[PDB]
Amino acid sequence: PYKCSVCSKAFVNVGDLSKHIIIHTG
Ligand SMILES: [Zn+2]
């Protein structure tokens, strides 16, 4: 599951999510 738990969100997209995690960790 490509969910982004830290911001209580969820994705099924591997690209969008992985791009999201890198900005999450800054
Ligand atoms: Zn997020």
Side-chain angles (χ1 to χ4, degrees):
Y2 296 101
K3 68 188 182 60
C4 195
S5 53
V6 177
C7 65
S8 58
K9 297 298 189 67
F11 299 80
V12 198
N13 293 150
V14 60
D16 283 80
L17 189 280
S18 305
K19 178 185 294 297
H20 189 17
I21 80 198
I22 62 96
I23 61 177
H24 253 229
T25 185

